[PDB]
Symmetry: D2
Subunit: 184 residues, 4 copies
């Protein structure tokens, strides 16, 4: 049983640490699980009910269908102002108005990375609150808060090289895989 996971990325900057983390998920995945990245949340317009009425942005239905046809989603994001980046919450707001709504019943795992010690934990719980409304099924264990990320991805090379973080994340994908196969 080959699973397909897609990753949703909360940062827009080229040198993003969270992006480096996301890029590593596919090389980290345990055999039997392919992982690809979704489109950029940066292509979405700001959510407006007027825009919705005129019609859903193509990039939003694209992301909706890729999530819906995926076996699980891994959300990978920094924490902004003790919460979720507004850009990322904005992508969530759009996906939440689609019918059928793509996150409903969808296995979901969260990963946050910060240069600081909290490792973006404040973000994960606000994001959970929204996901309750969307009826996603978010993995409780293990939680992935990557503090001091600056020390875990080597500079100029962009890559996540920290061995223990790769182990941790690889095991989180396994649990996500097990969660998905159990709601199947």
């Amino acid at each position: 049983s080959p699973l397909h996971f897609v990753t949703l990325l909360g940062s827009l900057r080229k040198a993003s640490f969270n992006a480096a983390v996301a890029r590593a998920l596919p090389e980290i995945a345990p055999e039997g699980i392919a992982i690809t990245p979704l489109g950029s949340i940066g292509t979405f317009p700001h959510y407006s009910q007027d825009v919705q009425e005129e019609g859903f942005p193509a990039p939003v239905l694209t992301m909706a269908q890729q999530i819906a046809t995926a076996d699980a989603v891994v959300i990978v994001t920094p924490e902004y102002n003790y919460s979720v980046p507004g850009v990322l919450k904005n992508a969530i707001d759009w996906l939440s108005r689609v019918s059928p709504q793509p996150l409903a019943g969808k296995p979901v795992a969260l990963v946050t990375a910060s240069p600081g010690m909290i490792g973006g934990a404040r973000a994960q719980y606000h994001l959970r609150q929204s996901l309750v409304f969307l009826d996603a099924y978010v993995l409780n264990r293990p939680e992935a808060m990557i503090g001091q990320v600056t020390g875990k991805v080597d500079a100029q090379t962009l890559e996540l090289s920290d061995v223990a973080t790769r182990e941790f994340l690889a095991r989180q994908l396994d649990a996500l895989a097990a969660l998905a196969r159990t709601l199947s």
Copy 2:
């Protein structure tokens, strides 16, 4: 002592109930307090550190200076997916990177309106969490959650006419005024 309050609006749609609420604040204000609306959060680009480096969007510094020169801010917003609209969190993310940062030390009052019973309370507390980081001074009492807003603003005329809601909000501005004069 004449105070000046500005209002930050969380919805983009023309027929927004929260917009109707905001529009009423100035006619509601107690003598000695002028209230004007800020620019639209819809003119901001998605927050990106790359964009920041190239330079702050003009609409962001505009809003920063209007807030900083204001005696207090009233934030008026719907709740999206049990949290703050991503568009509004995105405007918050931008303002948070300005120097000096405009919300630091700023008296702030929150107002949320929902057609439902919760009246957007889930949003107010997530928004508070962010505002702690920004060092804003957000009014505890009275809290303004306007549930069943559909019944409180008359249709086709756009206006907030519910007498008790106007009283409640007018008294919340007074408390905001008292909070501001006390940090002065």
Copy 3:
């Protein structure tokens, strides 16, 4: 073939949440037996010192009834925009138990309140603790019983409101489907 237990967050005899909790066995969908756990009020305040002189008997007892239950329904009021301390104290004791009763446990929440918001805030704080305990907490439908005052007979102390009974039976239906699935 399905057994649910109820954990109650108010101690006062005339508690609105207690009324709600008593109706659950009555309105439950057939094939579902729902029984009440013991009172959270018999726990001492958590303390690691006390724990190291062995677990309070009722703590092991409740741990036992939860662990071998198919699901837990937590029915509680909201105190100060959050979970009642006494309820949270129960949850704290249970979280230290030998193997921890709530790991993997299907859970539904029900809050009741005289006010507008119906204990909504309490639920989300509770969800955050349940994450750490690896409980599987039902998303839909959420049960917030605001304006409880008019839905419970002031004498008799039974939730009269028919619509509310029907709603809770549906939440039970959903909680069952969550349990069988997991």
Copy 4:
């Protein structure tokens, strides 16, 4: 000319948060007297039934020491991603007091933990209750003492760490400025 009281969220003799709480009077900026409130452990579990037979004596006592204090420093661990039930129980009792001691009260929070996060999650849940109580809770600087194990002498039970003592003295400075301002 400034008086702060401390409210402690752990009951265990060898509590890391207790160590932190004892250092506060020592490192306090001159002109600031800091004394400990009574133990939250002497409260019974909240109940409206108990309340209607009059408030537990220690509840009125603590209400009294808080109300006439210039500020409160709440020092507590994090239990299950939230506030310890026993601490929350104290807060629950205080919230019902005659006039409520925390309305308008300047407050700083300090959490300590062996782990990375240092009780961060606890603080934000607590802030949500304090909103309803109209406490004025200091934003900057926030004091999360992660990895507390290495900052407190295992024998002696005093927070040895110099940097941490210096940080807390600054938070006290800030809490004072908040108090004089309000």
